[PDB]
Structures are given as C-alpha cells and as structure tokens.
RNA sequence: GAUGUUAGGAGGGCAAAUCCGCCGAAUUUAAGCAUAUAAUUAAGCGGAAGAAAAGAAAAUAACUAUGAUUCCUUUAGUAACGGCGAGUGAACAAGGACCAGCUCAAACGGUUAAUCCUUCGUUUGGUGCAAACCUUUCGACGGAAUUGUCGUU
RNA sequence: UAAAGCUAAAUAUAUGUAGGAGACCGAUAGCAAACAAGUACCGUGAGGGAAAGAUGAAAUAGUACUCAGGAAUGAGCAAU
RNA sequence: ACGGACCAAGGAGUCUAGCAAAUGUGCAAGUGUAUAUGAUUCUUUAAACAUUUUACGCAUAAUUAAUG
RNA sequence: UUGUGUUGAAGCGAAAUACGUGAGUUUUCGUGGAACAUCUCCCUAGUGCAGAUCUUGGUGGAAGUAGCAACUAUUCAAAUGAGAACUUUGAAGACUGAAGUGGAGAAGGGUUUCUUGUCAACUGUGAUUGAACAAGAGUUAGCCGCUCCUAAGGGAUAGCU
RNA sequence: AGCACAGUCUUAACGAUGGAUGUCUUGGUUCCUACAGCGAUGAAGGCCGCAGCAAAAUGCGAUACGCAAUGAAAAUUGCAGUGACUGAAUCAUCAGAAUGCUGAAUGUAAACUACACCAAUUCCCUGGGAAUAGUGGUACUCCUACAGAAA
C-alpha cells in the first residue's frame, strides 16, 4: 500500500522496478477477474492507487531534474516556463509599464506630489 | 449495413452499452433506454 | 404513381444527406456538400446566430465540463504564484 | 445577522445543512456535555465520536445511557449500544438518535480531542 | 527582392450583457401611400476591455465672460426638422459626480548617435522549505540606425 | 490653433462566476428545466423540445409469519 | 344563427411616460431639495434624517413673425 | 392590532331551528395531520370565470358498439406447461412454384444474431412463442472489400475581388 | 330458509377513478454588491474512455468517480474490501504532478483511426547498459535577427 513519503527517498531505477512489479500484480488481478473469480477482485483498486502514487513520485522527480538542468539560461522549454494565462504573458512587465521618458522622470523627481496638511 | 466505419462501429457499441439496465445492487444505496426498433440512433 | 409524394416516396428514403460531424458530434455534416449545418465545420468558426437564442444557449461555454477553464477558475481568488506549493508539515 | 456576508435566507441555510461536506457534517453532529464534564473543561459541547457514552434526553428512550456504536453523517444520526429495535423481518437494528436529543457523559479522548479541549480552554 | 522545418517570437478559435467599427432591412405609424416613420434599430460581418469609447480645444461665448473628455440633474419636448402631416428633435449656458495632464513631428545639439536592440555573460543583493521571483551595473561579440536614434522645448 | 499620438476617474453591464437581499413565484406558477433538462422525443436539416417534486419522525421500522393460490395477488386469529 | 360532451385548474382594461379634470393632503407668491453632498446612516437602512458657517422646473405677465 | 392551533391548523366532504336581500359569513359531524387567521385600521396586487372551435390535464355517452374479411387451408395425435386454434415434434392435407416469404449482397437498421433463462408490460385474439424482458456470449483476412487511380465533380494554393 | 321485476332518473352513505385544493420547497425570478477572459504553454465545443460488482447524470483522463501536497481528521459502507488507535478511511483545500482522441487544429487527409517526409526516439546507471515503429517535428500569414545565393 506504500505511501509517498517512503518513495521520495528511493532512486529512479528502484522506483521503476517497483512500478513494473505493481503493474504485473495488477495484470494478474485483471486476469483473475476475467476468469471466474471474485476472491481478490477488490484488491485491484489499492494496487491501482499504489501504481498512481508511484507514477506521481517519479514524475515529480523527473520534473525536478528537468528544472535543475534548465536553471536560468534565458530560454527554457515552454513546460518549465511560467504557465500562466496567455494575456498575462503577453502583457508588459510592471517595470516596463513604469519606465518613464527621461524628461517625465526628471519632472517627477523634481516636483513630486507633496503632502501638505491644510489649516 | 455490414460495412461500417470504425467510428460508427464504436458509436454503435457505446449506444449498446448505454442501453443496458440499472445494476440492481445500486438500487439499494432507467428512463433513457431505447429499443432498436422504435427509436433510432439517427446516425 | 405508387412511389407518389407521400408514403410511396418515403420508401425511397435511404441514404443520408448528413452524417456525424467531427467537431460538433451532431449528425449534421452534409456529406455531399462537405460542410456542417450546425458549425460550418471546415470554416474555422462556429456558425452561431443571434437570431437563434435557443441554439446559442444549447452550445455555449457552460455546456460541457470545461476541462481547463474550470480548473483555472479560483486561481484569481487564490492569487498563488505559479510553481509554488504550500509549506510541508 | 449583523455581518451581511453570511445569509439569513432560509433556503440557503437549508441547502447548506443538507448538502454539507463531511467536515461540516462532523461539526454539526455535536452534543451537550454533562455538568461534570462542563466543570472539568471550559467546553460546552463537542462533536460526538464512536466510543463516547451518551445519555438520551428526548425521544421514546428518555433516559437510557449507552456507548455510541456508530455515528452516521448521511442521515445525521448516532446509534447507541442497546437502543435495539426489530425490523419487520426480525433483524435487530439500532434506533437512530439525533445529537440534539443526547447528552454525552463518558468521553472518548484521543490526541485530537485533547488538542480540541486545549483550544477551547 | 525572393528563399529557409535557420534563431527567437506574434496572429488564427471560443465567449459578448455592457463596448467599438462597418453593413443594413422590413413589419410598423401616417387610419390609404410613395417622402417621412419604424431606425442611423433587428439581423449580418468584423474588433476590444474590466470597462470600452471619448479626451487636453482649428471649443463655447458675446458675458463682469467660461476653459479636455465622460456621466448625472437640467436646458427641452425648446431651437429646429417634417407630404410643416404623422411624427422626429439637439446644442450652449446653469447645478453636480470626477477632475490630470501630456509626447511625437517640426525648431535646437556634429569637438563625432549621446541612442536602441539580440545572443553570450559577469556579481552584489532581497523574500521563499523548495519551485520561481525580485531587483543591482558591468562589459564584450554581434547587429539596427545619418532615408534620423537619443537629449533640449 | 485642423489635417500625428497617448491618458486614470466619475459612466455602462439581460454575459459568466461568486456573494447578499426581496410587500416576487410556489410545481398548469417560477427559468424551457425544483427531478439523470436543453434530458427524452420529433425533424434529412437549420431547428423544435416536453412530462415528471412530497410515504413516515425513523425504512438502521419498506411489509416477517400462516392459509388459499400455477403465479399475480387475496385473506388473516398474523405484523412494522 | 353561431360557441358550449363533461369536470378541475389556468385564463382577459394592465404597467410606464407625459397631459388634463376631479378629489384628498401640505405649503402658498411661491412651491418642489433635482442631481449631489453631509451625518455618532448602516440586520431592517436600497429608508429615514439633513441641506452646506441667486441650481433648475412650473408659477408670479402678457403680447408680437420679429428688433422687441 | 389580539389572537386560535397534535385536548388536531389549513384543506376537503357532507350538512346547519344559523346569519345576511345577496356576494358570502359562521358553525356542526367526518376525514385531515400542521399550520392558521385578523372585520382594529389601510397598504399592495399576477385578486374573483360558465363560455373564448379558450389552454392544460382528466373523465364520459357513443359502446362492450364499429370493428379485428388482401396474401386459397387447415386437420389429427403427442409433448411441454397452471393453462395451448396460432409453442414444439410426428402424421396427414395444402401453398410458395426458381420473376419464390428460396439462396447471396447494397442502401438503411444496429446487436435485431447466438445460447441459457423467461412472461410486468408489449407481441391490437390467446401465448408456455417472440425481433419483448434478463443474463451472458458472438464478428478472426497479405489474397473478400475499403486502403491506391482517376471521372462527373468538390475543397483549397497564387493571386484578384 | 324466503322476499325484492329489470332498466332509466334522483338523493344520501360508503368506495373506485382522477389529481384539484391546502400545506410544504436543496428551484426559479428580480434587484444589489464584487470581480472578470480562455486559447499554438493547444481554448471552448465534441468524441472516446475510466469504478471490484457501474447504465445515466456527477467527477475524472491510460496516475482516469482519482495521484501528490496542504487543512481537517476515524471512518467508509449495498456487499466485497480498505483504514485508524496520523502523509493512511473520508472530506474540504488544491498551488505540485499529470491531463486519451479531437477541435483554431496547424504535415497532407477525412463517412479513412488513410498517408507522407525529417529527426530514430526513450529510459536507466556514473562514459556504458537497456528498451520500444514508439516519440517528437513539418500549416498559412507575419515580425526581428542570421544565412548564403539572385538583380
Ligand atoms: Mg451504413
Ligand atoms: Mg422504423
Ligand atoms: Mg445529396
Ligand atoms: Mg479572433
Ligand atoms: Mg399604414
Ligand atoms: Mg390601419
Ligand atoms: Mg397597406
Ligand atoms: Mg446586431
Ligand atoms: Mg481608452
Ligand atoms: Mg445631457
Ligand atoms: Mg419646460
Ligand atoms: Mg430619427
Ligand atoms: Mg489633436
Ligand atoms: Mg485614443
Ligand atoms: Mg414548470
Ligand atoms: Mg349554420
Ligand atoms: Mg359568426
Ligand atoms: Mg358544437
Ligand atoms: Mg371548448
Ligand atoms: Mg389637483
Ligand atoms: Mg384560510
Ligand atoms: Mg388575471
Ligand atoms: Mg379560475
Ligand atoms: Mg371553467
Ligand atoms: Mg360570461
Ligand atoms: Mg381537452
Ligand atoms: Mg372521448
Ligand atoms: Mg397473432
Ligand atoms: Mg402449388
Ligand atoms: Mg397460385
Ligand atoms: Mg433469436
Ligand atoms: Mg395480445
Ligand atoms: Mg429465446
Ligand atoms: Mg432486448
Ligand atoms: Mg482483392
Ligand atoms: Mg495521388
Ligand atoms: Mg475533375
Ligand atoms: Mg471554394
Ligand atoms: Mg328495479
Ligand atoms: Mg479580451
Ligand atoms: Mg492524498
Ligand atoms: Mg493530511
Ligand atoms: Mg491535421
Ligand atoms: Mg475515401
Ligand atoms: Zn458540426
């Protein structure tokens, strides 16, 4: 029934091995079901779940490795890029939006909107 | 007839599957049946 | 004419004008014409008309699960940065 | 009432009650604790668990104490040791009691319960 | 100028209540009908956003003058239009909501394009458990650009 | 001071999602749809488009048992 | 002459705009606080309250195509 | 506003030495099983039905009536079964009469095929039958097709509108 | 053991038929407030799947009525089985992972699971050792940059 916290520590090969075993077990169960049996029909669900868990663990490991590989370097795969609503991606970064023509900037610096308490 | 496209065959199969009645055990915790002669799939 | 306008002529009704329509699944793909009556299938465009309000309602964005759109809803509310989990323990 | 984020609206409330998730259900199957228990812990009332020992107050069995057998969050009903009842068949089932109508005496107490008590304090 | 599965990017479709462009009827009213009316509406086609559009005067006034746009109250069912029939019909001022101004081009700077971008980098920081982000200034190697970038007003 | 350009606010919203309200409707009403409803079903097709809520406090009380019946059912001195 | 086999439920002068008359009510050469503001206004409150420490409407004057 | 309700509300049914000219009101008994009035005043409206070839749903008389008459035609015995004119088997008698209710395919249908069950409805008489219902099963290709070619034609590329 | 003629019509009582009335109400409607886009990073829409016993809807996507993580937190139950004594059974949350075939659909096609061509691709172990015909890519228009040819 193997829960994830055990599996994080395992190396990828070991994980793969585990997964194959689980798959084999599942296949066996399926075969049994197909044949006139209902002894361990309900065992299958758990096995399936276990398999799923294993897959998840492995997938996340793989993703982490990928991320490590493509750390920085301007361009990246579009997977490892910031998946985010298209419009937002298109949109100008806040900094870009801010960026002021030099005269305007100067003006801002000189005559900023002051605080002035009226009495 | 006796020469279908794969898609059509699959659809037919789906329809057949849909046809079958409520599994009786559920009733312890159907109106969309279709008889092949009276109501057509209209494919 | 035995194959006259009514019942006799309904005997000669075999052979579909429309089949199933890749895209809409609505048995309204005119085979001979190669064009769906409720889509405009080959036209990259959905063929909907403001004169058909019922039609519009029976195929809008809400009608059918929204595999991705639904998932993205709530994200604004959350405003979580992408890639980020919660703290463990 | 005074905060207008919550709804008074009867319908809405009823929907919430009936269609509540499991956590909500658990929360709203609470029971009054006896005087002794109240004195012991600042708590007035607790969500009832399996091995608690309740005294029934209302219903046909206004007095029969017993260990809670099962709590059933679908129907909002606890069942109690000996509140037995034959069906038409003869099969001896437990009679359901809603936790309004019960007051819990002896307390099932795991770490979670302890934590809850501490929080209440 | 073609050409490239060259390197990097963009568009396409869905959705529409409000919104912006076109395109564009007729029923209807006139006790008929033809101009009118319906209506610069419906439908059609296209395009945006959380709002859109408008907007910083080639404006109004004729005053002791006001001062971008928008919206509300009004002006006003008024001026006006109209087989002067049916019917249609604003604007300025006034009272408010809200109030925000600006930069190109042209002028000027050649004791030198000061600009700008792509790729490759380099090394201080900040929050994060990580993931990512956030900024920091520093060069190269490319190009772009004198058929004009940047500063000055 | 036309023939180049930008610009927040007050404004609108019968679409969607989420809230909240009502001198609103109460199952022939109210959305077409309180229910596996844009579902079933009809139409080649564009499209058209329903009906259908309520046992009881509790079925973890949904009809045990006996008799008559081929069975459905019926009856009970039997039963929730 | 037409409609009505029967029964149940549904089923038809309504709502807005602007004008008028009638009548009630307030105030009365005035009247209406319009938008909007303000409040120690905030379940009800989308009401109620208030009107800044010469707005506008209709009326108070008519008449003329008109300068008047 | 000031009240009635599980010592039984609304509703409904039948009434009543009842009241009202009348719309109605009121009360009794029964059923019913939870709400209900306000006439103290006035507020509000999707406010009152016999008609609309009204709408919707239901139910009648017609009426156990019309009718269940194309395709020449059935009969005997036995079986199965609660039950057999129309299920099965046998024996007769018949018909289709290779332009066939015969064999194969196309379109269309879509599992109707098949076995085992089986009868609530349906199979306009019956029914143990069934194309109904339920449970399972069943479609095997290098050569049969599609897949390739081009046809009448279609959709596009360039432009051009 | 007897006696009512029968039918038609009427009234009352007690039933059938039907679903009115009344009572409800996880629904609608209206108004108010608030935010407000999804998509070549493959959208909406459509198909096909996915449960031990599973039709619909609901949920989900070959990790398929769910995985991870977080916050609850002892059950779930029709049976089978799985769990507790807290990453576990179940809920909510949902940011990680994943997301079949399509569809703008985009390699050519389309009543095809038809067909090209270019990369062979993928995994494991710290440069080898394993797999699988599997996996990607190739649309049109456009922009910047580069390329070597054209006048
Ligand atoms: Mg076919
Ligand atoms: Mg037929
Ligand atoms: Mg044709
Ligand atoms: Mg577009
Ligand atoms: Mg006319
Ligand atoms: Mg006329
Ligand atoms: Mg005419
Ligand atoms: Mg339009
Ligand atoms: Mg703008
Ligand atoms: Mg105005
Ligand atoms: Mg006026
Ligand atoms: Mg006009
Ligand atoms: Mg200008
Ligand atoms: Mg502009
Ligand atoms: Mg309805
Ligand atoms: Mg006549
Ligand atoms: Mg007449
Ligand atoms: Mg008649
Ligand atoms: Mg009639
Ligand atoms: Mg008056
Ligand atoms: Mg009453
Ligand atoms: Mg009416
Ligand atoms: Mg009526
Ligand atoms: Mg009537
Ligand atoms: Mg009448
Ligand atoms: Mg009728
Ligand atoms: Mg009749
Ligand atoms: Mg027969
Ligand atoms: Mg013969
Ligand atoms: Mg003959
Ligand atoms: Mg058969
Ligand atoms: Mg029959
Ligand atoms: Mg059979
Ligand atoms: Mg069948
Ligand atoms: Mg061959
Ligand atoms: Mg060819
Ligand atoms: Mg040709
Ligand atoms: Mg063409
Ligand atoms: Mg008699
Ligand atoms: Mg947008
Ligand atoms: Mg989990
Ligand atoms: Mg946890
Ligand atoms: Mg393609
Ligand atoms: Mg073909
Ligand atoms: Zn289509």
Three-state secondary structure readout of A27-73: HHHHHHHHCCCCCCCCHHHHHHHHHHHHHHHHHHHHHHHHHHHCCCC
The count of other CB atoms within 10 Å of the CB of residue A57 is: 22
Looking up tokens 């309740």 gives D54
Which resolution in angstroms does this entry have? 3.2
Closest CA to the C1' of I36: that residue is C76
Q: Round to the nearest angstrom and report the end-to-end CA distance of chain D.
A: 27
Kindly list the partner chains of chain B, i.e. chains with 3 or more CB atom pairs below 8 Å: C
Taking the C-alpha atoms of residue D17 and residue D11, their distance in angstroms, rounded to an integer, is 10
Interchain CB contact of B42 with C (< 8 Å): yes
Taking the C-alpha atoms of residue A51 and residue A27, their distance in angstroms, rounded to an integer, is 12
Taking the C-alpha atoms of residue A83 and residue C72, their distance in angstroms, rounded to an integer, is 11
Where chain A is broken, by preceding residue (C–N > 2.5 Å)? Answer: none
Judge: B11–C20 Cβ closer than 8 Å, yes or no.
yes
**Which residues in chain C are contacts of A66 at CB distance < 8 A?**
none
Q: Please name the residues in contact with A53: beta carbons below 8 A apart, sequence gap of 6 or more.
A: A2, A3, A4, A7
- Token code pair at residue D106: 């002896």
Q: What is the DSSP string of D17-80?
A: HHH--HHHHHHTSEEEE-HHHHHHSS-SEEE--TT-EEEE-SSS-TT-EEEEEEEETTTTEEEE
Directed axis angle between helix A43-69 and helix A12-34, to 10°? 150
Judge: C82–A85 Cβ closer than 8 Å, yes or no.
no
Taking the C-alpha atoms of residue D110 and residue D47, their distance in angstroms, rounded to an integer, is 13
Taking the C-alpha atoms of residue C27 and residue A35, their distance in angstroms, rounded to an integer, is 40
The method recorded for this entry reads: cryo-EM
Interchain CB contact of A85 with C (< 8 Å): yes
Q: Please name the residues in contact with C43: beta carbons below 8 A apart, sequence gap of 6 or more.
A: C35
DSSP label of C9: H
């Amino acid at each position: 029934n193997v829960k994830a916290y055990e599996l994080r520590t395992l190396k990828k090969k070991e994980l793969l091995d585990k997964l194959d075993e689980l798959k084999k077990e599942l296949s066996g169960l399926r075969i049994s079901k197909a044949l006139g049996n209902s002894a361990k029909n309900s065992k299958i669900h758990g096995v399936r779940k276990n398999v799923a868990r294993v897959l998840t663990v492995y997938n996340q490991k793989r993703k982490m490795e990928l991320r490590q590989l493509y750390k920085n370097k301007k361009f990246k795969p579009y997977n490892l890029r910031k998946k985010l609503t298209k419009n937002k991606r298109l949109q100008l970064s806040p900094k870009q939006k801010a960026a002021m023509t030099l005269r305007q900037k100067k003006k801002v610096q000189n005559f900023p909107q002051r605080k002035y308490l009226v009495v | 007839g006796s020469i279908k496209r794969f898609r059509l065959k699959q659809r037919l199969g789906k329809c057949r599957r849909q046809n079958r009645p409520v599994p009786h055990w559920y009733r312890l915790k159907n109106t969309k049946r279709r008889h092949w002669r009276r109501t057509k799939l209209g494919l | 004419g035995k194959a006259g306008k009514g019942t006799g002529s309904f005997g000669k009704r075999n052979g579909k004008t429309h089949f199933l329509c890749l895209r809409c699944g609505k048995r309204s793909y005119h085979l001979q014409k190669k064009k769906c009556a409720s889509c405009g299938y080959p036209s990259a465009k959905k063929r909907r008309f403001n004169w058909s309000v019922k039609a519009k309602r029976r195929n809008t964005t809400g009608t059918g699960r929204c595999r991705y759109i639904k998932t993205l809803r709530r994200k604004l509310k959350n405003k979580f940065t992408e890639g980020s989990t919660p703290k463990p323990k | 009432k005074f905060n207008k984020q919550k709804s008074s609206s009867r319908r809405k409330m009823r929907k919430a009650h009936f269609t509540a998730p499991a956590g909500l259900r658990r929360k709203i199957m609470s029971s009054k604790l006896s005087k002794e228990l109240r004195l012991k812990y600042k708590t007035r009332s607790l969500p009832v668990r399996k091995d608690d020992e309740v005294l029934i107050c209302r219903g046909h069995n206004h007095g029969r104490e017993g260990k809670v057998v099962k709590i059933n969050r679908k129907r909002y009903k606890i069942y109690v040791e000996r509140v037995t009842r034959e069906k038409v068949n003869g099969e001896s089932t437990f009679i359901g009691i809603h936790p309004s109508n019960v007051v819990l005496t002896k307390l099932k107490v795991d770490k979670n319960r302890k934590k809850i008590l501490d929080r209440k304090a």
